[PDB]
Every structure is written in structure tokens, then in C-alpha cells.
Amino acid sequence: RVSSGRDLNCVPEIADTLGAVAKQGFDFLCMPVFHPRFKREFIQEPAKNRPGPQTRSDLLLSGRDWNTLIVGKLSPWIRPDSKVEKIRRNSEAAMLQELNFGAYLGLPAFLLPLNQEDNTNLARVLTNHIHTGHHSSMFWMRVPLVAPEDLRDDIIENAPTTHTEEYSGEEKTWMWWHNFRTLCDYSKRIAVALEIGADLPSNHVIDRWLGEPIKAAILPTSIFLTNKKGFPVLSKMHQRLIFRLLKLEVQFIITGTNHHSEKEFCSYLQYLEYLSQNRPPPNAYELFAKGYEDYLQSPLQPLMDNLESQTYEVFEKDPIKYSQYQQAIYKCLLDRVPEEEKDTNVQVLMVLGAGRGPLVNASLRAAKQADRRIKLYAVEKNPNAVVTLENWQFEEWGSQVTVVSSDMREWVAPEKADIIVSELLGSFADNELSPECLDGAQHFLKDDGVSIPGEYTSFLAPISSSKLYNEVRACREKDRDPEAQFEMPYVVRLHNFHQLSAPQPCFTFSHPNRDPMIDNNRYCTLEFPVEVNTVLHGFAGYFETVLYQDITLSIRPETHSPGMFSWFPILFPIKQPITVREGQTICVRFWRCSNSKKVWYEWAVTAPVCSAIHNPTGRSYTIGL
Template identity: 25%
Template sequence: MSRHNGLILRTSDVSNFDQKYSIFTEKFKLIYIINDDTTNLQTTIDYLHTKHPDWNKYTIIQSTELTRSDIEYVVKFDDLLELTNIPSQHIYILLTMENINSTESWHQYNIFKLNNHHHNFSLALEYTDTTVSIENFQYWLTEPISFILFPTTSTTSSSTPDFIFNIFQQKSIPIPLLIIEDIPQYEQKLLYLKNISKPHYQYYSQPLQPLVEDLSMGIYKQFESDNTKYNQYQQAFELAISDLTRLKLPRIKILIIGPGTGKLIDKLWKVLDKKLLPNYDILAIEKNPICVPILNEKNTKSWNNKIQIINQDIQKYTGDNNYNLIISELIGSFGDNELCPEILSQFNQPRPDLIMIPNSYTSFLQPIYTPFKIKKISLIKLGNYYPISQPQEMWNWNHPGEYELTQTKSLTFANAQGYKISGFLGWFECTLYGHVQIQCHDVNLGNYCKSWYPIYFPIHKSKLKPNQDLLVEFNRINNGENVWYEYKFLNKVYNQHGVSYCMSLQHS
């Protein structure tokens, strides 16, 4: 189907066809017939046939009489279930806003599709002023949507479908074809709204391997643009320094692991300057050689040469472990997928005079369906998907604290409305220190950090039944050389032995 706007002809308005058709060839590539007077349907078809012998190639008919095999038909959702003879050609199922808001309609649609799986369907929307439930709409948006219909009953309204366009935008879906009746009144405004409602992009990439590959300056700049993260770190530093000061230690020893180009130290320096802390030592260990000259320059210009900077892999560090404050930003999108538990294990023995930032983090998992095709474990900025069940906690890491580096968890999810599953979405929630937290999932919370994308664990797309319990077995495996996740769903094991994704413990 062309993505140009369509011209609407009503069979009840045959007398005005010449006037309307005169603008068809100039502005439109599609004719949309609304069969609101069945006695005139054949007259309408005869009229179009006189205009062009191939009229049927650019015409679709909204009707319950699906009699021709050379036409694509539009059937209202409420009429769909009454059909007995469904033709073999493509059919557009026209949803109202009321249908979208109805959970029952979603179930009816999926059952109909299951019973007629050999037919070719796609969805279309009929716009009305009814407010749409975004929670319900997200299910429908994972299905192909061919066009939005704006009949006279909607175009005479003073409202505009900004909220519908915004949902398409947020879900990273291009706004489909617009078929508009009463063109002079409504066309320009709708087309303007469509043009400015560009979809957010969906993005995915392979997870970072910071122990194996040194990060580029471009990645550091992207990370350091996350003001929420560093402001939260600064709050955590203030709480930690205040608590350590109360211990009346003769000297506070601070270790910073992986400071990158120094933004963490900048935030720490502001706190130390504010607290007027007299006696402290700071050691920064950074393995990436491109960062060290930047750190040295900042040390001279901004930090009064108070920072001892070592260019070394922290895993090879054999110096003093008796620090009072250990700071790092080694958390990955899933919490532990950049090997934070392994890297910090040598410092993790609890002591009354030891604070580690981050203090703890928890991994979460949620089954989802997305039409977006991803075959490997990836970091993903995903718009068009629906959750199948509520997220559940996987495992938790505490610093300092004792833990096993190999973890196993089985989770059972209750499926309410999902009929398909494509994979599992994972993310972290982290307590830096005290009440200060960060997370990478809920953009509506003030502690959301944009520099992490959730992680996605794909599976073979599978059909589901409502109220079906979904069991997934998840393993985090550390064999001393590599760390990887294996997960089992519907008797199939994914990423076995880390075949498509594993994290190396050896720095190249």
C-alpha cells in the first residue's frame, strides 16, 4: 500500500463522486470506499472502472460483504467475529479506540488470528475522541498497523490526535498512512502533526567488555553526559564522607577504581572541598592508557596534585587494601555483566571503617514480546514491546559482603495478556550509599540514568496462552577465565557455554 494519504468515497454519496475524484490523481494514490449504502456498491465500482481499468489495484473497500477476490477489504473489528467466509486476499481489521481499550477485544483478536492463521491480516485504526489506554495500546502496536482512518465524525471535531501520534513516537513506530475525509478542513493540520512526530530510534549493541577492550573517548563522553548518575554519586560521597568523619579516623584513605577521564574525581573533589577534610589520601587506578594524560592534567590544574594516579589493571594491584572508601562505576546494564563482583572481590571483606560505593545492586528480569528482531544478547533501547508479566528480582550483590560468583535462579512468571514471547529484558537497581539510588529502566523516576541501556536476552519467538505460567532457569557461570549467562526456557538452553556472549576475566 502506498504511504500517501487516501481519498475516501462513500457509496451513499455517489452523486458527488466526480467532484471528489477530480483531486484524486493529483493528491492521492489510494481510494478508500466506505460501503455505507450497500445498494450503491456496484455503482461505485462501475464508476471507478470507467475511470481506470486497474481501479482495483489502488482501492480498498470497508464492507462486510467480502465477495470479490481481486479487492482488499477492510472489516470493522466488531463485525469480524461474525464472518463465515473469509477470502484469501489481505484483510485490514479496523479497530476503534473502544476496541483498543478493551482487554476482551485483544483476546478475541488473538483467538480469531489463531483460528485463521492461514489468512493474511493487518490492523488499522479508526480515530475518535475517545482517550486511549496506553497500557492496552502497547499490545496492539506490536501488530502491523497499515493506516489510521479519519472519517467525517472525527474530522469535524475540534480536537487533534496528538496523543495518538505521541504514542507512536514513544514506541519508536513510524506513523502509518493517514486516510482523511473532509480534506480541506483537516488535511494540513494532520500532515503537520505527522511530520513533526518522528519516531524515537530503537538501538541495540553488543554489551561492553571493559576488561578486554579499552573504551574509546567517544564512549567516555557519552557516559559523562549522564548528569543524573554523577549527581547521585556526589550525594553518596557527601553521606559517606560525613559518616567516615564521625569515626574520627586519623587519616581517610580513598581508592578510586577506573576513574576514566576524571568526572568521578571531580564530584569527589567538590565534596572534599566543601567538607574541608584535612587528612586524606586518594589513589586512582586506571587501566586505560588514553585516560592517564587527561587525569594527570586535571591533577595539576584542578586537584592540587592530591591524587596519586597509577596506570594499571586493578586485578594486578598488589598494594595496600586497607582503604576506608572505595569508589567505582563498574556496574553493567544487568548489574554484574561488566564483572563488578569479580573486580571488587579482593576488597570486599567487611570492616567497620570501610564504605564501598556502590554499596549494593540488584538484577531484574521481565519477559516481553517485541517484533524487533534481535538474535544475540544485546544492550537495547527498545520502544515497541509489551511486558508479559511483572519484573522479578534475580540476584543481589553487596559491597562489602560475601557472595558466590556463580549464581543460579529459577523464576516463574504469570502471563496475563501475552500471546507471544520474544525474550527477557534485564536491568539493575543500585544503592550507591545510604538512601541514594540509581537505575536504568524507569525513565519517569528521578534516579534514572541514561548512560545504561537495559540488556535483552532473546529466545526463539514462541506462542503463549493467557494465564500460562512461564518458567525460566537462569545461570551466571564463572569458570575462572570467563563469565557468562545460560538460560533455559521451554526446554531450550540459550547461550550455552557462552557461545554468543561471555565476559573475559583476562585483560588483553
């Protein structure tokens, strides 16, 4: 169920207040750490020398309570970007005082408002405070989904609400946040508290906040409608937004007074709980994937490195994937061996990269399903996995399966293969060097031999995620190029991001590749039409593969294989975010480069502005042959 918080601007005494919101069922309380009306002077006498105390004592709650249950709020009179110098200098001193008192109490979060365009001085003070001792505390920037100026009632006679459409103008609230977080240099301690009004804007205004670090969603009591019974509820469009935020796994803050006087105040919260609780449980895939959401991992290199036993275990725990491989082989055997030849003709079947032999078992099931004879070879260069195969071979399989412990490009086969079955695909299809491996194994494939898969294609889509951009930025290591983290791909269950255009195909490979002049190097130019204002942070990578004829695997979102979690998407980031406004086309260039020892990718944005060429000479990232 939901992790909820209460927002109050009136706390007569903290102990009774915190106890009350606890009974209501709130997990934390947002409150002022100084009385909101208690304006303080720091320069001009005599107000300067006001007798203390300046606020309530830290002894009123336990250290646990301050660390867990209390979220600080900046006093509303503090205006660091005032046009009046006196108010600026005083608000600067006031802001530091309240922030420093929050740090003193060890609060897990502190709320600061963005409710105008110019928050440059606010940013300067916050950035200075952030860079004064390494702390854990979060800063929730309170940003309205719609500016109060654009939400006001049309009741001013000589200043009417502009009924004319302004696409960029209706996104102004996002630009307030973007400018602020840019000034503060994408600090990981600065997140968004998105405040939602009674009237929701256009979808493009909401979609602007996809990929943004939203930690809180503020729901005023105003926006809640009333049913026949009298309980508070939300509109179908408001419910839609809650379900989008429940996926992002944000904390919900209730603000404003009780207007539904007849019923208890907990009713507001009980409704949010009802929404979240009445949702399809995760069950298969969803829960395993939920833990990995936006978790950056280095792509596996099963050729260069020997995979651990538990890495093969997760590969093996994908029944849909091996159901398909079985069906692909099942179909192929019926095509190659006529019914009358079933007892005479025995097909030579070679599993190239057998691991612990799930494809070996898939081959045996397919054979007796198809009612055809097969002679199995299990080729695996990982000698630790060969232990698993040879124990399988002695105990269960027998002579039928022949386990070969070597590289498929090196192995001298005693006979040629009718079918070769491989699993050498990464999240970007060819990023584990399936092409080079199957190319080297192609000599012991029969003149009319079949490769499973026979084809695979990589797909790229430009994405916006300030969240993921910041996670890549945090992967800076000592004893290497400070920007190396931006010049290498990551395998990540992409969650908090925004697809800016439909995925297009990048690189395709066919097997067998009978071409005399075999060159696995590639250069691909993709034109991505963008119909939204956004910021480009990288390119999401997927793949499709033809196992045999119509039997296919895909992690392409649009055509994704149902209930298959062997592969998460790949992410190709860029050093500098690129502004892309409505209508503009994103042009990305992708190279697949190689020498005798290494294979790598280079990539560059060429429109609407040029980026640097990423990973030149594979300096940051290489895939070992």
C-alpha cells in the same frame, strides 16, 4: 508536527487530485491503481479478452511522485479467500496483477485489507509475491481496532448485538493480524494500518496492539465530533489514543468525505497538527533517546575491551548520576571522620575504573563540600584513558591524585583503602563483571572499609514486541549458528513493546563480600503473573544500586532516576515466541554461570510452556574476565 496522508477511493484524474490533497497539507495519497469497480476476468471468455488499457498510464506522474507521494490500495472486489473456486482463482490472478503494478511504479507502500478471520490464501499470494525479487516496498495490512460486525447498530430485530462480555472475542481483530503475519513468517515488509472506529473498545483490546509494527493509523471523518464553532474535534478517549500513537511515531491517514461542509477539509488535519504541536517538547534526555528507540546494540564489555574516547564522553554527560556519586561520598566522609578529626584524619579513597576521571572530580567536590582531607588513587586498566587522567593529574589535580595504570585484581596497593568508588555496572547490574573486579580489589580495602556502590540488584520483566523480535531475527550473520542472535542480550532503548508483568529482582551482589566461600554464580526462578492475552518475545532487563545508605541509582522504570541516560535497558530475547493467555503465570529461569576465563547468562521459560535453555556453555554469548 504530524506526517499525514489522505485516503480516497475516487480519483477522477490523479494530477488534479494529488495537487488538491497537497494544498490541504497531506504528505502522501492512498488511492486505487485500478478503478475499484473495474472487475477483471482472467479465465472465462469473452470477458477474458477485454480490450485495454487496463488502467491509467505510469507517465501521468514522475518517478519521484510514485516513489514518495502514492500509496497503492487493493481493489475491494479481490477476494482470494472466497468460498467460490471461480472467485478464488480469479482474485489470486487479480491480486498478483495489482501488487506487480505497484512494484512496477515503485510505490513505497501498498494497502491490503484484513476484515475477516480466514486470510490464508491472501497470505499465500502475498508471501509468493514478497519472495519474487528482493524489493523495498512495504505492505500495510488494514486491520480494524473493532470488527464491523461488533461495531454495527443494534437495529436487526432477530439478530441482536451480544451484550454479554467476551474478553478474547473482543480481541478477534488482533488474531486476524497475528495469524496472517505468522503465515507470512514475520516478513519485515508486512506492517499494520490500524483503523479506529467511533466507539473505542476496552483498554485490553487497544493494549493488544502494543509491540505490533503499526506504521499507519486510519481516522475516518465519522469519528470526529463538532465543537460550538463547527470545527472537527475528537473525544478525550480518542485524544488519549492519538497521543499513544504520536509516541509510536506512526503516519495518520484521513479517510471518508467532508461532513463539516461549512469549514474547509484541511480542518480535520489541522486538528491532528494542533494535538501533536501542543505537546511537551523533548528537551533533555527525550531527544537523545528518541534516535535510539528500539535500536539493538551489543552490550559494552569495559573489562575485556578498551572503551573509545566518545563512549566515555556520553558516560560523563550525566550530571544527575555524578551528583549522586558526590552525595554518596560526601555522606560517607562525615560518617567515617568525626568533626574534631577533620585536620588529623585523611581518608584513602580509590576510584577503581576511573576512565577520564569524572568520579575523581566527584571525590574532590565531595571532600571540600564535607570539609575533610582525602588521598585519591585513580586505578584504570584502559591505557588510552590513562592518557586523559595523567594530563588531568599534571595540569589540574597534582600530587593529591595518584594515577595507577593496571587491573584492580592485579594491582599491589602501597596502602589500604577507607572507601572504594566504582562505576563497573552494566544495564543488568553485574553484566560487566563488577562482582569479580571488586572481589579482586577487596584485599586492599580496610577491615572496616566501604564500597560505593555497596549493593546492586538486577530486575527482569517479560515483554511482548513482534517489532523487536523481528529486529533480533534480522541479526542473523554468516559463519555462526543461525539462531545465535536469540541467545545473546542487547542494550536497547525499548519503545514499541508491552510489559506483561511488574519487574521482579533477579540477581543481587553486596560489597565488600566477606563470605569465606565466595560464589558469584546464581540460579533464580521468577513467577510473573500475566492478566492479559499476549505473545512473549523476550525479557526486559533493568538494575538498581545503593551507592551509600539512601543515595541510589535506578533504570527500573517504576523507580527510575530522573534525567539519567548513562544506561538504556537490556533485552534477553527467546528463539520461539510463546502464547500467554489471561490468568497464566510466565515462569522464567535465569542462571549466572562462570569458569576461570568467562562469565555468561543462561535462561529458559518453563511455563506456561517450556523453551530451550538459551546460551548453553556461553556458546552464543560470553563476558570475558
